[PDB]
A paper describes a structure:
The SARS-CoV-2 translates its genome into polyproteins that must be cleaved to release individual proteins essential for replication of the virus. Given that Mpro processes the majority of these sites, any intervention that stops this process, such as an inhibitor, would block viral growth. The crystal structures of inactive SARS-CoV-2 Mpro, with the catalytic Cys145 mutated to Ala, with 9 substrate and 6 product complexes were determined to sub-2.5 Å resolution. As in previous apo and inhibitor-bound crystal structures, Mpro crystallized as a homodimer.
We used 12-mer peptides, P6-P6’ (with the scissile bond between P1 and P1'), in our co-crystal structures. Six of the nine complexes were solved with the dimer in the asymmetric unit (in P21 or P212121), with both active sites in the homodimer occupied with the substrate, while the other three had a monomer in the asymmetric unit (in C21). In these cocrystal structures, both active sites were fully occupied with the noncleaved substrate in essentially the same conformation. We observed that the substrate peptide was extended along the Mpro active site with the scissile bond (P1 glutamine to P1’ residue) positioned between the catalytic dyad in all cocrystal structures. The N-terminal (or non-prime) side of the substrate had an antiparallel beta-strand conformation which was conserved in all structures, with the substrate residues and side chains well resolved. The binding mode of the C-terminal residues (prime side) was more varied, especially beyond P3’ position, and lacked full electron density. In addition to the fully conserved P1 glutamine, which is stabilized through multiple molecular interactions, the large hydrophobic residue at P2 was extended deep into the S2 binding pocket in all structures. The sidechain of the conserved P1 glutamine was also extensively coordinated in another hydrogen bonding network. The volume from P4 to P2’ is highly conserved between all of the substrate complexes, despite the variation in amino acid sequences; this high conservation reflects the specificity and likely evolutionarily-constrained regions of the enzyme. As an example, the nps8-nsp9 substrate, which is the most conserved cleavage site between coronaviral species, fits extremely well within the substrate envelope.
Residue numbers in the entry:
A (entry chain A): 1 to 302
B (entry chain B): 1 to 305
C (entry chain D): 118 to 127
D (entry chain C): 119 to 126
The structure:
Amino acid sequence: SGFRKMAFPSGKVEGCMVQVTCGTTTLNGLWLDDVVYCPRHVICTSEDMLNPNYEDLLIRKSNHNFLVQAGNVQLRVIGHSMQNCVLKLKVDTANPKTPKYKFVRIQPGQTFSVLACYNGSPSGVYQCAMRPNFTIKGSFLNGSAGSVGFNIDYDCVSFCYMHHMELPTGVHAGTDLEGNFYGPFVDRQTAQAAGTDTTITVNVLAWLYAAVINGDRWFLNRFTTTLNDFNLVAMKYNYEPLTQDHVDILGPLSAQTGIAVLDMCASLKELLQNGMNGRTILGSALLEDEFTPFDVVRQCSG
Amino acid sequence: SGFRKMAFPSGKVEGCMVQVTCGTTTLNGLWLDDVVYCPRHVICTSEDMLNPNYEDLLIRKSNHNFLVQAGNVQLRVIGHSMQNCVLKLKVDTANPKTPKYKFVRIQPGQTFSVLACYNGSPSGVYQCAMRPNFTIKGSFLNGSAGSVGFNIDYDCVSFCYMHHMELPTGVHAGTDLEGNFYGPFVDRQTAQAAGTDTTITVNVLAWLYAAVINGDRWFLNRFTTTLNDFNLVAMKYNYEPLTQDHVDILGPLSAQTGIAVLDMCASLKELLQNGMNGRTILGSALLEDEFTPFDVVRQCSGVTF
Amino acid sequence: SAVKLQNNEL
Amino acid sequence: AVKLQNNE
C-alpha cells in the first residue's frame, strides 16, 4: 500500500551527464554513444542572449571551442552540428555507460523523472508533468540547463525533455531531444509568458482511483454524470476537458475498482464544490494531477 | 526557482541491489563488498511467519540454502550469519560496484531516499521521512522487502533503512542496516499498531523558509513568539517540541531570507490556529514536514554529488 | 488485520 | 524576466 511521487532510478542517466563549456558559458550535456546533446544557448555570451542568431554564432566556432568534461576526463570534440534548439557535439569516444535509450516527444499530461544537474553532476531526482500550457513546474537554478527528463519503463530510457530556461513565474520550458520546444517558447530572454495553467483532469481521476485502491472511499457519491455535463463543470474550475479517449484510458482502473469512469467524474464534481473539509486524500489536501493512469497502475498493482 | 520533493541520485545504490531467495520466499538484498544484507524473514515459509523462531529457523539452514542473483549472475554464498533482524550472506566475490558507504541510524524526523526494488531490480525512488512514531509513509508492495533508504553525505552513501513489512494501517516499518528496528515493532505477521504520530516542527519551519525563498510570503506577520510559548500550542496541535538545536540548524536559512527563526515560529503558530485561509504554500494546502533544513539548502543552492 | 511481511512468494 | 539557465 501507499502512494508516492515516485521517480525512476536515475543511475542510467547519471552515467550520461557531462559538462559543456563554451567561452565562459557552461551547462550540462547528455552523452550518448559518441554524441553529446546540450542546449544551443551555450554558444551565447553574457551579451547577445536577447536576439542571438544561433546559426551565425555556431559557424564562428571551432571544435576546440567546446570544452566537454566527463568527470575527470576531457572529451575530444571532433564534430558539431545544430538540430533545432539543441547542439550535437560529436566526440571521439563512445560513452561506455550508454544505456538502451530512445527519444520520445510527449503530450501534455505525461509525467517523467528529472535528474537536475549542475556542472555535469547530479543534484537530485524528482517527478514532473508536462503541463497543459506546455511548461513544467521544475526545481531549476542557473546552470541546470541540459538536465533531462526521462522514463525508464522496462529496460529502455525514454528521454523526453531537455531543460533550457525559466519563465518569469518560475515555471520552466525546454525541448524534446530533437531540439523542438514544448509550447510556443523560444530560447531567447525576450519577454515570454506561460498561458493560463489548467488542471490535468484525467490525471486527477487516475489519482482518485489510486486512493480507492488504497482503501479510501470517503469522497465518492451515489451520483453519475454525462461526459458533457462534467466538462461544463470542470471548465469552471480551470480543469482540462475530459475526452472520450481519456474515458477509455481509465477503463482498466474503472474495471479494477468497480467504479465507472463517469461515476468517479461525479465524485470529482463534488470535491471541487466542497473542498475536503479538513480531510486528505493520499496524504494531500489538494487534488493531485501529476499521476497518469499508467503511473497509478505501475505503482499500485505493479 | 521551484521546489520539489527531491530524492538523492540513486546510481550508486542501484549497482548494489540483488535478489535473495530461500525456498519460495524472495526479496531484495544489498550487495556491499563481499557481503549481502537482507531481511532475516527470508528464511520464513508462508506458514512460518505468524510466530517464527528465527534462531531455530536459521540453525537448520546452510550456505547453499540461499540463492543470491546479481542480475543474470548467481553469487556463491560462502558464509551466513544473523545480526538482529537482518541476514548477512558472505559471498566469494566483492561487489565491483561497491561505492564509498557507511551504515548510519537516523533520528525520527530525518529524511532519506528510498530505492524501491522488486526481484533485485530497482524500480523507483522517492523521498520520505522517518515519522516521529518511527513509521515510514512509503509506497511498497509484496516483494519490496530489502529495499533500502539512504542519504548522500558529501561523497559517501549513508545507508539508514532497510524495508521489512507493512502495518495494517498501510504505513511501513523496517530496520537500519545493522538489523535494529525503527519503532516498537517486530518482524512477524501479527496485529501491531504504532504510537500516535506528530508533525516534524523543525521540518515545517524549513519548508516555510523554502517558500519564502520562492517568493511565497503571505503567511509572514509582524509577530514573534518564544520557545516556551510556541511549544505550549505546538503540543496542543500534536506538533513535535522545538528545541534550541532546531533553532540553531535553521540559522543559515534565517539569515539568508532575513527572517528570524522565532519570527517564523509565530507564522507557523498562527497557521495552526487559523488554518491557511484558502491559500497554498509551495503548491500545497498542507503544512509539509518531509523537508529538513539541509534538504532546503541542498535543493535551493544546487548541491551536487 | 495483521502485519504483512512484504517478501514475495514463488 | 526570462532566464536561459546556463551558468557564467
